[PDB]
User: Which sequence fits this backbone?
């Protein structure tokens, strides 16, 4: 009855998965907490089991991680980079089966699950180079015979809490950067993607163990909100990177602030696409379709608001409706499938409530709006017109494929409407107007962390910093100098002279 | 008689080498030039043969590379980085056989041959990350409604001329960086390491082929000075990276300057180690030995001058002599061996000439000084005392294991004596004094491009920029922002408004 016992899913064993798997790793494998069975969202079948972390498991793992840090922080960064290079290699070796497991346990289509593993492989390669670059400037001191240098050192233990929607890549972004920065990591993933968490940890553990490194450098404590809360409260967790709901993220931030820890918060998005009258509609329509229905609308960066200039609103909505009707629904691992299930039955519940609420607030469902009558957690990708831009439901993040469509007339008002929500993750305008594009990018433009032109709100690349503003939580991951969040800056003044001149020319004698 | 036809050298075939090899690669393999045989400097046996480039080969190769550039410069930098990543992997998979070829044809010991291939693997890994990073700042314009962007673009065709002593890694540094910067490469290596050049190019070519890219992205034209001079004079070679002797590099520099090209010169070194009275002698002696005799004294970063404080001069000399006597000499592929042959008989002759000139200028050979009596190009690593720091022979760079030892008393003079030569590549002090170390690193310290403390003059790592000042030519390779030498900067102002406000507030 478990999928992992059926011959058609024996590829799962290529990841080292079994009927029941240890969900704690700290150099040894265990798990004395509750046993969780995870399910395939496309057919509601159970896949396999994971023994989760008890509180005693959490405690011992934190200690072993902090013991491992003493060794790992002593290893020169480029040598830590080499470890991350081997992790990249080990992921490349398993990218198809790992991508398939993402499609199976999480529910996104296979090209997206493989693509998610590729994001991790890519950030690994990026971090290898970074391991020879991280640091700060040597600055010219105003004092004769003094050196002034900005040093960067690891913060220590980086707790990483991740959500279901990207059960591989988010951890990967955090882990590759944290590792080359000399931190140890402790991962608590979404309970409903526990096999993914275990399978990834199995890959990393083999690299660490083959290199005779303490496995706790990349520790795993599978569990629920109780483990996550313990991490938020744990003085030994020097940085807590939390990707998840804004509501939970706000509590995580408060807990970490209460103990003067560091948090990196990657929270909700309410991402708008804006199509101006001069837009290339052959870009707008497919970009909106992918941004809205990709991952069944379950990305932090999913397009949730579509603003269309009055002149082209009806045409775009009609073209969008014709495109939605061609979406190929099915099992996310099957060929030519573009659209799979939502991740849980609760997600279907939230989808239905949001559709209901949209109607109660005056919206019209012009496409979709229903649960699909078929095995699994399938819903129709949904388009809603007629709501005011400030309708409560439109300002709410519903992690589901509902696209709220609005009319607008002029640039100033629609930029303001993009910015009026509490979320601040991604945003996109479709236009040919040069000045408009640079205004969008400027101080009176989009207030989001990702500000795009003529592309969807989703699908960032790893070379830039990824994250948002306002209720999205302010953290950044991946590229640019995001690595600085995983390290502590020191400003270091070295007097190598025989005199003591004081800053600002102060004479104290 | 060819070693590649003998059974114990069949491993050469794992690099795709055969009895006669094509020395031109531009996407297809060819070579209408003179056939050169290369020889093993440990025993003077012929290894295999390479058909070098004719000038018609050179001409067709340049044209193919520049057409390949139009494809390659359109490929996003991160995707170019992916190609270089795969070159790293293919080198990694051949590191043993390639290192062995370096030991066979060039003559350095096996651990340095492997280590040199590792340097190329390392710069590949570094360039992959750089390929997602290269670029310039977006700057705040003083003008409303204007953007100000610093852009970087490939220069086009990068010619790479390399020397015998690092016949893999030098090309590797230039190749990895030039590629992610969007350039195509044309390589002319040392004729006496032609097999190494072909073997590296075979590895790269397979990667380009497997990725459906034109092979001319990494072109090879094996040949001698006539080819190198053609590259220096060729307006189609946008950047010429030249690693070699100061004497040739100066003419390369002038030829490139005459046509308003770009040159990256990596030239000779006359590198000093300075041991102060407070130095840890247990660090000094091993460091000086490896720095002087590593690669049989044939690195541009080799220690050629050793300054020792009067108080410890005699002790350090005596300890260096006893350590030299323990140097293990033999064939460079035998695993126990620390010291192999010089690369050529001409290197033996230049060494002999330098030793006798040191004697004629008043120096004393306290260790070595003689050629050895075994097959190959072996000479004794040599220590000369008693010369003045400005002895004519001590200011010359002889590419051979001769270490000139001098006394000093004061920090100011020995810093000056470090700086007094024409070269300016590497330098090193051994001391525990905190103030002395930062003075060494400061404006009144070493004038060199590499300024080390308590490590020898050789053996840098890829994270930093590599190169020298003064007659070493000023080029930098590998790390930091050396990549900018392979790209052209543009300062770009975009007026996206309906107004034309003038810089500096000029009302015209
Ligand atoms: N320049 C001062 C700044 C102190 C600031 C403070 O006391 O709040 C210092 O470095 O001591």
Assistant:
């Amino acid at each position: 009855t478990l999928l992992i016992n059926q011959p058609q899913y024996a590829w799962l064993k290529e990841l080292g998965l079994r009927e029941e798997n240890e969900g704690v790793y700290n150099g040894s494998w265990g798990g004395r907490g509750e046993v969780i069975t995870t399910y395939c969202p496309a057919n509601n079948e159970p896949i396999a089991r994971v023994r989760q972390a008890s509180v005693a498991d959490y405690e011992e793992t934190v200690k072993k991680a902090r013991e491992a840090w003493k060794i790992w922080a002593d290893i020169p960064a480029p040598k830590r980079g080499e470890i991350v290079r081997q992790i990249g290699d080990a992921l490349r070796e398993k990218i198809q089966v790992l991508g398939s497991l993402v499609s199976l346990e999480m529910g996104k289509i296979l090209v997206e699950g493989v693509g998610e593993v590729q994001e991790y492989v890519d950030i690994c390669d990026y971090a290898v180079g970074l391991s020879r670059m991280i640091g700060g400037p040597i600055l010219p001191s105003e004092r004769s015979g003094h050196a002034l240098i900005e040093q960067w050192n690891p913060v220590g233990l980086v707790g990483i809490i991740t959500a279901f929607s990207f059960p591989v890549a988010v951890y990967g972004w955090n882990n590759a950067i944290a590792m080359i920065c000399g931190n140890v990591c402790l991962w608590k993933g979404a309970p409903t993607t526990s096999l993914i968490s275990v399978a990834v940890t199995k890959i990393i553990a083999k690299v660490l163990e083959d290199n005779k490194l303490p496995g706790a450098i990349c520790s795993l404590t599978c569990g629920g909100a109780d483990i996550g809360t313990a991490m938020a409260k744990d003085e030994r967790v020097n940085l807590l990177s939390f990707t998840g709901s804004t509501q939970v993220g706000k509590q995580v931030g408060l807990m970490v602030q209460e103990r003067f820890g560091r948090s990196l918060l990657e929270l909700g998005g309410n991402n708008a696409i804006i199509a101006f009258e001069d837009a290339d509609l052959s870009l707008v329509v497919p970009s909106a379709l992918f941004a809205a229905v990709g991952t069944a609308g379950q990305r932090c960066t999913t397009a949730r608001r579509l603003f269309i200039h009055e002149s082209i609103h009806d045409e775009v909505v009609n073209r969008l409706k014709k495109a939605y009707a061609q979406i190929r629904v099915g099992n996310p691992w099957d060929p030519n499938v573009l659209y799979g299930p939502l991740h849980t039955k609760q997600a279907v519940s939230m989808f239905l409530g949001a559709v209901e609420e949209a109607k109660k607030e005056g919206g019209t469902v012009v496409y979709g709006g229903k649960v699909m009558d078929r095995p699994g957690n399938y819903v129709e990708p949904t388009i809603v017109t007629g709501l005011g831009h400030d309708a409560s439901i439109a300002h709410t993040e519903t992690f589901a494929p509902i696209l709220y469509v609005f009319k607008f007339k002029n640039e100033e008002e629609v930029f303001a409407w993009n910015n009026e929500v509490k979320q601040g993750l991604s945003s996109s305008i479709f236009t040919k107007d040069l000045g408009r594009i640079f205004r969008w990018l400027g101080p009176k433009g989009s207030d989001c962390g990702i500000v795009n032109v003529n592309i969807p709100t989703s699908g960032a690349e790893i070379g830039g910093a990824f994250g948002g503003e306002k209720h999205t939580g302010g953290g950044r991951e991946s590229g640019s100098d995001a690595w600085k969040q995983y390290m502590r800056r020191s400003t270091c003044t070295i007097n190598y002279s025989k005199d003591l001149p004081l800053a600002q020319g102060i004479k104290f004698q």
Summary: Residues 59 and 230 of chain A are 9 Å apart (CA to CA).
